Amino acid sequence: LHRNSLIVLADVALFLALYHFLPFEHNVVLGISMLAFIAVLWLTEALHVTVTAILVPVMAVFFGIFETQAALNNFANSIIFLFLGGFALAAAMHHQGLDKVIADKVLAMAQGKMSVAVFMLFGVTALLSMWISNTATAAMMLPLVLGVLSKVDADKQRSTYVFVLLGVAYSASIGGIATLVGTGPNAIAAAEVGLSFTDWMKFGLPTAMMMLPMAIAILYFLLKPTLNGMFELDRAPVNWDKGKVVTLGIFGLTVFLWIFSSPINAALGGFKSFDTLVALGAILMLSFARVVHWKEIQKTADWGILLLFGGGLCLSNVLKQTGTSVFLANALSDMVSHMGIFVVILVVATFVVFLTEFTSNVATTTLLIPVFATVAEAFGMSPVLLSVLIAVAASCAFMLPVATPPNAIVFASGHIKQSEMMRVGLYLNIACIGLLTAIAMLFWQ
Amino acid sequence: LHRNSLIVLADVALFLALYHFLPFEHNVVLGISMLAFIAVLWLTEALHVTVTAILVPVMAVFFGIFETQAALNNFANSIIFLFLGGFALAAAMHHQGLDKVIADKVLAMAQGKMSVAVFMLFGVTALLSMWISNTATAAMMLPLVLGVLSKVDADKQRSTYVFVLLGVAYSASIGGIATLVGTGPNAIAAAEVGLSFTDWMKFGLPTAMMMLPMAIAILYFLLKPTLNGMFELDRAPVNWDKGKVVTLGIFGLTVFLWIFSSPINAALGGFKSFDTLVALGAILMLSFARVVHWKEIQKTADWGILLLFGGGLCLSNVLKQTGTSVFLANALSDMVSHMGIFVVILVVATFVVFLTEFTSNVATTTLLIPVFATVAEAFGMSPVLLSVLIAVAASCAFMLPVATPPNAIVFASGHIKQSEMMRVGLYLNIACIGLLTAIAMLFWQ
Ligand code: NA
Ligand code: NA
Ligand code: NA
Ligand code: NA
């Protein structure tokens, strides 16, 4: 009866059709049929992204691709735990309120000017996003933005107070592209290609550094009348209490180890997934130091995403084992050799940047990274480039809401028009396809 | 400064002491020192049970027992997922309110009599517990019990209304010993020795059937004046709405497959952890049938316990790999051969039944099952017996509150005295040590 129940039934039909009708060696048919099936379910979101994630192994197993345990093992991948460590680290500084104090301390640095208020609102949203989340950083910033944009209250004077709402909802998404914790895609890239925390920062941070000015410049150079206004610093001020200095201390130590993971680990006897251990060491320090309880981390942790990661890793392995990765590489062989590597990464960059407007950031990365990385490997090229690219571009959701929760959060502010966001995003999208294809060309040799 | 911070520091000291001072082959020292360290942390609960669980792998890995990934893989064990399926199945019938309707439908079967009210209150709490939880079934029953015990309101007439409060808090714990979903210990036993869902029901259900009458008989034959009273059926009645019949349908189908897993799987081509698949198939059916959203399952699921499971599995493997399992078997060799198998299981049964009053149900099972099962295997005996026994006896917490949340829930009802519970539990404990040692002897050949 429901829309989504039909999409599912239509998909079951599609699979059954592809399964019986495709003219290839059995394994490839199965792999293709599965790929299409999952592809739909994550794009349409007829079933919750995570339910789909769980579906991958159960299928794999039933269609004899893997044994039950072999398939589930995917879910305990070390990056998944690294991300859990990220969730715990966030949970700590939110419950501690260290996110609030970094907001006030930097926001009250601006004396009483709306000019240097919003520019410091974007700079904080981005810096906080690096470690916390997007969905979380946005919902946490909304009250702080509405507080400031209440002096220039005139909402007949909209474009003063739309530049700042849409400003943070992008700064949350751009701040995610900074480190391996922050947004899902980055994790799925790292898990697929085997990146360290300090590896994904070498890519992402430059890109975030580049993109945030480029994004504000585009919002600015539409309709900004914000060089005017005054402040209302209205609420109780903040102060470092029982180890908000300790949470920062652990955080600092954790981030330190993460950056210097390469020499620290090497000069420690080279432990296997060192970053994940650092992330668990975080969980342990944070608990021994009593600074955050567990019930907090259980609420903060998005187990749905943690599960999703594994569902997609499983998929990747389904593609390899069935030889679907190699079959597609053969199929694309003529096309990709006729295309330049510029052409390819331009097409890839464009495809996602717009496909991410329709669908969930992760859901698409969980779909695309496996297909692309594994096919790239069949061609005997380094799957890293394409993967990192997909992961970044997936977080380039700037057009409509429903693209990312940060978009839908500043939108529910019953003010910003559908039409408005759609065309700033349309510019920013293209702006990015440039910047990415540009940077992706520079990170080659 | 805090109590627990010192316990931890004292433990760090203890480890360091055992590590440097024990006079054995390196591996055994390491294994022993670890075993002791963890043993403390789970018994004292100086760090949250789950934080300790995470500590196992991080140790294992740092002390070169396992590689980082190999260690984490423990957490994706198929039973862990089977339990997640249980959490989803529960989440469904609670959000759907199918737990409420099974309460009313059976409670309103009793026309207006307190005699057949409380006897049907225990029978429901136990039946609901089989699938839901203990902590959850208890907190869900408390309002339904206080509703009934408001006609015989006279709390100078306490022992009418203490027999029923303490009655359900035991019926929740006894109902847990029925199936593989229900309480943690049962899962940790199944994961350790490789039990099917239908395997742990062959043990547990008879034991629950036996124990519930035996427990009420002991509460009854203390201070019961409840053959008197009348009903106040006060609140809106219940009715089967949008697929409360569907939730029951899936539930029924799931439970059906679980029981008949053996012939269904065998006549299907023998898939590996069939029960876990059935449990995931539950999650999928429940979502396709739209009957429960995911955000619900993420709230219901105790990820803390799911993580704990893996922490203990890891431990077990730490014990094997270091040969600590074999070293202890050699150490106990003279003692256990001097003891009868009766003597042994009597000592085991007694030890836990009382140790579970001081500590968390799971925490102790996660500690003891590994030690006992792996040592039992070194003796070349079937680790099943001792394990099942420990898992059951761990859920025999009847004395003080803080033993189980169900105990602490009916206690916060600002009525039942410390002294009262402590001596009913003291009888019921001994009563069980009999029943278990009795049954455990019968389940031999
Ligand atoms: Na982020
Ligand atoms: Na998106
Ligand atoms: Na239970
Ligand atoms: Na207990």
Numbering used by the authors:
A (entry chain B), B (entry chain A): 18 to 462
Question: What is the paper's account of this structure, in its own sentences?
Answer:
Membrane transporters belonging to the ubiquitous divalent anion/Na+ symporter (DASS) family move Krebs cycle intermediates or sulphate across the cell membrane typically by utilizing the preexisting Na+ gradient. However, like other well-characterized bacterial DASS proteins, VcINDY is known to transport succinate and other C4-dicarboxylates, rather than citrate (C6-tricarboxylate)1319. Our structure reveals a homodimeric arrangement, with each VcINDY protomer comprising eleven membrane-spanning helices (TM1–TM11), two re-entrant helix-turn-helix hairpins (HPin and HPout) and two interfacial helices (H4c and H9c). Viewed in parallel to the membrane, the VcINDY dimer is shaped like an inverted bowl with its concave mouth facing the cytoplasm, allowing the aqueous solution to reach the midpoint of the membrane.
To validate this idea as well as to gain new insights into the mechanism of human DASS, we replaced eight amino acids surrounding the citrate-binding cleft by their counterparts in NaCT, which primarily transports citrate6. We crystallized this octuple mutant of VcINDY, denoted MT5, in complex with citrate and determined the crystal structure. Although the MT5 structure remains similar to that of VcINDY, one important difference centres on the pro-S carboxylate of the bound citrate. Specifically, the side-chain hydroxyl of S200T and the backbone amide of P201G in MT5 each donate an H-bond to the pro-S carboxylate, whereas the side chain of T379V makes van der Waals interactions with the citrate. In contrast to that in VcINDY, the pro-S carboxylate latches onto the amino ends of TM5b and the second helix in HPout in MT5, with its putative negative charge stabilized by the positive helix dipoles (crystallization pH∼7). Since NaCT transports the trianionic citrate6, our structure may foretell the interactions between NaCT and its bound substrate. Specifically, 95 mM citrate reduced the succinate transport rate by <20% in VcINDY, whereas a mere 10 mM citrate decreased the transport rate by >40% in MT5 (at pH 7.4). Since VcINDY and MT5 were inserted into the liposome membrane in presumably two orientations, our data suggested that the membrane-embedded MT5 interacts with trianionic citrate more strongly than VcINDY in both the inward- and outward-facing states. This stark difference is likely attributed to the altered pose of the pro-S carboxylate seen in MT5. In support of this notion, the temperature factors for the bound citrate in MT5 are lower than those in VcINDY, arguing that the citrate was more firmly bound to MT5 than VcINDY at pH∼7. On the other hand, given the amino-acid sequence similarity between VcINDY and NaCT as well as the homologue swap mutations carried by MT5, MT5 likely recapitulates the substrate-binding properties of NaCT considerably.
